Amino acid sequence: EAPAAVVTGAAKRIGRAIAVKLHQTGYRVVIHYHNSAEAAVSLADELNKERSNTAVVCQADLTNSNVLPASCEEIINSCFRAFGRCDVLVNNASAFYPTPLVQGKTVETQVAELIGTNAIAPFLLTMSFAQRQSSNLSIVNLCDAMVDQPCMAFSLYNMGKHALVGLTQSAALELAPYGIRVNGVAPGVSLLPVAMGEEEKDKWRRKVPLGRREASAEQIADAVIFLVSGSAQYITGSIIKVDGGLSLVHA
Amino acid sequence: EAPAAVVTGAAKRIGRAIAVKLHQTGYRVVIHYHNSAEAAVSLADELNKERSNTAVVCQADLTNSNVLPASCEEIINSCFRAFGRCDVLVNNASAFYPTPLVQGKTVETQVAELIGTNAIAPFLLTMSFAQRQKGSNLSIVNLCDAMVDQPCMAFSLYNMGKHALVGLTQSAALELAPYGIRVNGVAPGVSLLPVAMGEEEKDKWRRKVPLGRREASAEQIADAVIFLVSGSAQYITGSIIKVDGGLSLVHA
Amino acid sequence: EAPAAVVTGAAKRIGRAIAVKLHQTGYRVVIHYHNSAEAAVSLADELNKERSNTAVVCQADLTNSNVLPASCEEIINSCFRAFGRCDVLVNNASAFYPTPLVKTVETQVAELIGTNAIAPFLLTMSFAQRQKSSNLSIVNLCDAMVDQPCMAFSLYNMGKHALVGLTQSAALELAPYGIRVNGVAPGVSLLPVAMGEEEKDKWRRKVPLGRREASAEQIADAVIFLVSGSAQYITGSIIKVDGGLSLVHA
Amino acid sequence: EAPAAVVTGAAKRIGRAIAVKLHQTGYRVVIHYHNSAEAAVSLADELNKERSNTAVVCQADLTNSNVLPASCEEIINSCFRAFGRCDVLVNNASAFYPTPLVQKTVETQVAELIGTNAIAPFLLTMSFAQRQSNLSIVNLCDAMVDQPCMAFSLYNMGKHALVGLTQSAALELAPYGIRVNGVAPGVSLLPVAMGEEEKDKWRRKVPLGRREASAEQIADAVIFLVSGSAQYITGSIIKVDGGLSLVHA
Numbered sequence A: 001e002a003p004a005a006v007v008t009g010a011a012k013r014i015g016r017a018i019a020v021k022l023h024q025t026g027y028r029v030v031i032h033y034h035n036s037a038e039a040a041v042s043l044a045d046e047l048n049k050e051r052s053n054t055a056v057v058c059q060a061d062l063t064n065s066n067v068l069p070a071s072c073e074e075i076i077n078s079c080f081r082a083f084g085r086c087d088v089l090v091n092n093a094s095a096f097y098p099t100p101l102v103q104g105k106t107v108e109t110q111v112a113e114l115i116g117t118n119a120i121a122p123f124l125l126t127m128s129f130a131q132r133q134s135s136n137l138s139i140v141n142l143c144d145a146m147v148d149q150p151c152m153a154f155s156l157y158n159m160g161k162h163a164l165v166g167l168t169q170s171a172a173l174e175l176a177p178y179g180i181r182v183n184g185v186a187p188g189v190s191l192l193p194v195a196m197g198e199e200e201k202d203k204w205r206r207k208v209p210l211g212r213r214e215a216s217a218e219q220i221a222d223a224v225i226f227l228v229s230g231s232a233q234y235i236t237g238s239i240i241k242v243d244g245g246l247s248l249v250h251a
Numbered sequence B: 001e002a003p004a005a006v007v008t009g010a011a012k013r014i015g016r017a018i019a020v021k022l023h024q025t026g027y028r029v030v031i032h033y034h035n036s037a038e039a040a041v042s043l044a045d046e047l048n049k050e051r052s053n054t055a056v057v058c059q060a061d062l063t064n065s066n067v068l069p070a071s072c073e074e075i076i077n078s079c080f081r082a083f084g085r086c087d088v089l090v091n092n093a094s095a096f097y098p099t100p101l102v103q104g105k106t107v108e109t110q111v112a113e114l115i116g117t118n119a120i121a122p123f124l125l126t127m128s129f130a131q132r133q134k135g136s137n138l139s140i141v142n143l144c145d146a147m148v149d150q151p152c153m154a155f156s157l158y159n160m161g162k163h164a165l166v167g168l169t170q171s172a173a174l175e176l177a178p179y180g181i182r183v184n185g186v187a188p189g190v191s192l193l194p195v196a197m198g199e200e201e202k203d204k205w206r207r208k209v210p211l212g213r214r215e216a217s218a219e220q221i222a223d224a225v226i227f228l229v230s231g232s233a234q235y236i237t238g239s240i241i242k243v244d245g246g247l248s249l250v251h252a
Numbered sequence C: 001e002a003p004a005a006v007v008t009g010a011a012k013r014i015g016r017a018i019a020v021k022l023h024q025t026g027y028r029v030v031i032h033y034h035n036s037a038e039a040a041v042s043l044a045d046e047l048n049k050e051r052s053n054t055a056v057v058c059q060a061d062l063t064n065s066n067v068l069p070a071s072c073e074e075i076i077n078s079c080f081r082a083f084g085r086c087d088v089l090v091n092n093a094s095a096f097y098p099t100p101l102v103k104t105v106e107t108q109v110a111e112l113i114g115t116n117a118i119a120p121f122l123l124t125m126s127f128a129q130r131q132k133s134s135n136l137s138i139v140n141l142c143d144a145m146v147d148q149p150c151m152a153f154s155l156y157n158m159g160k161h162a163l164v165g166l167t168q169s170a171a172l173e174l175a176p177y178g179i180r181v182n183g184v185a186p187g188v189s190l191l192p193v194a195m196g197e198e199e200k201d202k203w204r205r206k207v208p209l210g211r212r213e214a215s216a217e218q219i220a221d222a223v224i225f226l227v228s229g230s231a232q233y234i235t236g237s238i239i240k241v242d243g244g245l246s247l248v249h250a
Numbered sequence D: 001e002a003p004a005a006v007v008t009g010a011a012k013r014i015g016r017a018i019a020v021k022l023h024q025t026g027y028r029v030v031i032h033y034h035n036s037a038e039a040a041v042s043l044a045d046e047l048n049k050e051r052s053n054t055a056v057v058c059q060a061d062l063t064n065s066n067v068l069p070a071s072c073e074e075i076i077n078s079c080f081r082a083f084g085r086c087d088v089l090v091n092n093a094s095a096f097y098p099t100p101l102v103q104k105t106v107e108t109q110v111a112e113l114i115g116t117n118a119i120a121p122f123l124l125t126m127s128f129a130q131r132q133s134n135l136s137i138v139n140l141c142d143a144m145v146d147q148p149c150m151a152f153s154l155y156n157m158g159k160h161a162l163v164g165l166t167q168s169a170a171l172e173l174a175p176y177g178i179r180v181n182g183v184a185p186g187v188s189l190l191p192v193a194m195g196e197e198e199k200d201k202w203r204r205k206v207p208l209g210r211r212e213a214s215a216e217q218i219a220d221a222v223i224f225l226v227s228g229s230a231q232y233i234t235g236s237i238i239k240v241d242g243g244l245s246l247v248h249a
Ligand SMILES: NC(=O)c1ccc[n+]([C@@H]2O[C@H](COP(=O)([O-])OP(=O)(O)OC[C@H]3O[C@@H](n4cnc5c(N)ncnc54)[C@H](OP(=O)(O)O)[C@@H]3O)[C@@H](O)[C@H]2O)c1
Pocket: A008, A009, A010, A011, A012, A013, A014, A015, A032, A033, A034, A035, A036, A037, A060, A061, A062, A063, A091, A092, A093, A094, A095, A096, A113, A117, A142, A143, A144, A145, A186, A187, A188, A189, A190, A191, A192, A193
C-alpha cells in the first residue's frame, strides 16, 4: 500500500515541489492550501492524472486562534479520510512579512499569523499527527538557515522560525519512542518572493557562495525526500541546511 | 537623575533578586507582578525604606490576548510616570509547565500563557520600550534557558517560547542597535528549583551540575544581569550568557 | 565513466561501510588504511571481485608531522594514478582515546589533532589543488556530541571542533570551484570493539530513537546522500545521525 | 595577598589591555611575549611603578613543537616563581594570517596557527591545573568563528578547537573549582598592517556604533569572567561584538 503525506501550503513554490516529489516517490498527498485554491486544484488534477485517486486538497487557515487546534486535527483527519493512513507531515506553510519594532493589520493579528503559521500550527499538527498513529513515520519542518542572522525588522517571523527549531527538537525527543522522526530542512535563499524586483533578487543571489544563485524548489524538496526516506531512519532532531553556504558568509 | 528599570515577574525568586541588585546599583525600579501582590508590595516597601520613592509596583497578566499590547505599553508607561525615564527592561516573567504532545487548561490557553509570557510579551515590551526612546546606557535583558537545545521531556510549548526569545534577543539587538539600545540574554541552567518540586528531584538536578553540584543562587543570575546593563558591557549586544555551572555541557 | 572516491580509515567499521556503499553506488575507491593491511586488502579483493579494477589500497599514518603534507598529497595522487580522477574525499580516519588534563603529550597532540583535523585539512588542500556533469565533494566524519564532550577527551574534542571549522571554511573557499564540503555527525554508532556489553548498553539506553546505536551502514547512508546529485546545493552542512542523543539532557 | 595572572601575548593590543585591567583590579601579572620584548618590558616597568614587584615578563614561542609542552610548563612555573601562586590564565596570544587551500611551509603554518590558537592553550591549561579562592581561565575566542574569513582555514580551525577546549576543560576542571570561559571579539583593534580603507569597511559593518571594540571593552569582559560576579559561570563564551555576528551577508 502506498504511504500518505500531508504538505501544508502546497499549492505553489516550495510546498508544490515537495508534494510533487513525494508523489513521484510513490506517496499519496494531501495538498493543504489557504487562499490559493485554483493552484491547489490544478496541482491535484495533475497528480491524479498520473495516478488515480492519489491527491486531494484541503483548505485551512493556520493563523493562531482558539479553533486552530480543531483545524489542524481536521487536516490530519483529511489524510486518513482520503487515504486511510498518514505517514508523513511536512510543515511548509508560512506567513512572511516585516513587523518593525519602531513605528493594516493589528499587532495581535501579526502575532497570530506569523507565530501561528510558523510555530503554533506546526505544533498542533504534530500533536494531531502523533495522536492518530515496517512503518516509516516522520515530520519535516521547513526552517530557515538564516535564523541566527535575521533580516532587519522581521522579529515576529524570526521568533516563529526559532520556535520551530525548538519544536523540531522537542518533538524529536518526545515522539522517538513512537518511532516518529522529526527533522528540519533550512533553506537560505530559494525561490525569492514574487513581489521582489529582479535587482533585489540578484543582490541575494550574488551572496551565495555555491553558484551565486538561489536554490531551486526541487533542491529543497530533495532534502525533504531524503529525510522521509529509509536512508534517514536513524536521523531525528536534525536540521539540514540547504543554503549553498549562504549562512557561512560574514557581513 | 538615577536610571530606571522595569523587571517583569519581580515579586519572587530570580526576578526579585534582579530587582534588588538593580536597586542596590542605584536604579529606580518597577516591580511587575501578576498574582503576587503582597510580595511585590513587600519588596517595594523594603527598597523604598532604603531610598524613598525609588520603587513602584505594576500589575499585569502577560498571557497573550487582545489586550496584551495595551498591557505591555502600560508597564513601560508606569516606569516613565514614576521616574520620568526607562533605561533598562528585564524580561523575567515566565509561565512554565509541561504540554505533552500525546494524550484543566485547553491547549490554546497553554499556547497563550507559555508563548505569551516567554516570547510575545517580551516582544511587545521591547517595542514599547524602544518607541518611548524612538528619539545614556539603554538595554534589555531577556531571561533565557541554557538548556534550550536539550529540552525537558514534554515541555514543547515552553521550549518553543524560550527559543522564540533567543530569536527576539538577536533580532532586537540588530534592529535597535542604531538607537543605542543593547539587547542581551542571561541563560540559567538550574537556579532556584520550583517550589513544588520534591526534595529528591531537586537533589537529582543538583548532582548533575559540574561546578559545585548545586543550583545557582538567584543572586548569581542577577550578577550577570548587572554586568550586561553596566558600562562594562557597552559593546555587548545580541549575546546570551549562560550561568549554568557547566550543566549544558553534560551529555546524557 | 565511473567517479572515484578516497575514504580514510576504510578497512573497518564505519569507513569500511562507507567504502562499500560508495562502491555499490558506482564509485571506484581508494581504501586508505594505517595498521589494518589485511582488512584493507580483503575489502579491496571483495570489491574487485564485484567489479574488476575498481578498488585499490593506500597506506599512510595520518599523525601530524613534517611529512604529513606529503603523505596526504600521495593519498590523493593515488586516486588519480588508479582512476584518473578524484571526485569524493571522505575524512573518516580518527585516533580516539582520553587525554586527561590532570605516549608523550606531544605524541597525543600529533595523533588526535593530526588524524581528526590536520590530515583532513591537508587532504582537502591536495584534493582541491588537483581540481584547480561533475559532482565534487568532501564529507568529514564529525561528532554529534562535540558540544557535550566526554570527560577527559579534550584533545579528541578539540580535533572534532577543528573539523567543524574546516568543514565550514573549506565549504566557503571551495564553493567557487564547485566543490561542496559537508559533515556527517554520528552520536553513538559502532561501539569500540573491546567495550563490555554492559557499557555499550549504558549508551544505547540513552538514545531516544530505538535505544540502540547506529549501524555503520546508517552512517554511510548520510554520506551517500551528501555526495549525491540530490545534495547539489548543500555545502557547509553537518548532518547529525544520532537518534536524538544530542538532544538528551543530563 | 594578591592573586596572580598569566596573560599570553600581553605586550601589545588586547593582551596589553587585559594585563593592565587585571593589574588595576589588584592582580600581579606575568606578561608573556614572543617577539615584542621592548614593549613587554615597558609594560612591566609601568605596572611595577604603580605597585612594586607586581609584574614580570616571560618570553616564549607558542608554535606547536615537541618542546611546546615544556615552554607552557615554564610559563606557569614563571608565575609561581615570581608570585608563589597562579590564579588566572588568559589565553590571548594568537598567530593570524591566511592559509589558502588552493595555491613559510604548510607544516610551519599548521604549527603556528594551531599551536598558538589551540595547542598552547591546552598545554597551558594542563600545566595551570596540575600546579594548583577564585581560579579561572579565559580563552580569547572569535565571535565570527562560524562566519569565517576567506582563506583563513587553519586560523579558524584553531579557534574552533579553542571552543572545544573551553568546554572540555570547563567540564573536567569543575571538580577542582577552576572555571573555564571565553571572550569572543568580533572586530576590535584592526591589524596594524590593514589599510585604512579596509579598516573602515569593517567598522561600517558593526551594528552597534559602526566602530570596532576598544581593547579595554574586550578586557572588561575578561574582568567580569575572572571576578566573583561570575562564580557560577563556566563553559560560557561571551561575544563582545557589537552585533556583528548577527549580520547576514
Ligand atoms: N523561499 C525562500 O527562499 C525560503 C527561505 C527560507 C525558508 N523558507 C521556508 O520554506 C517554506 C516555503 O517557502 P516559500 O517561499 O515557498 O513559502 P511562501 O510561498 O511564502 O508561503 C507558502 C504558503 O504558505 C501559505 N500560508 C501563508 N499564510 C497562511 C495562513 N494564514 N494559513 C495557511 N497557510 C498559509 C500560503 O498558502 P496559500 O498560497 O494557499 O494562501 C503560501 O502559498 C516556508 O516555511 C519558508 O519560511 C523559504
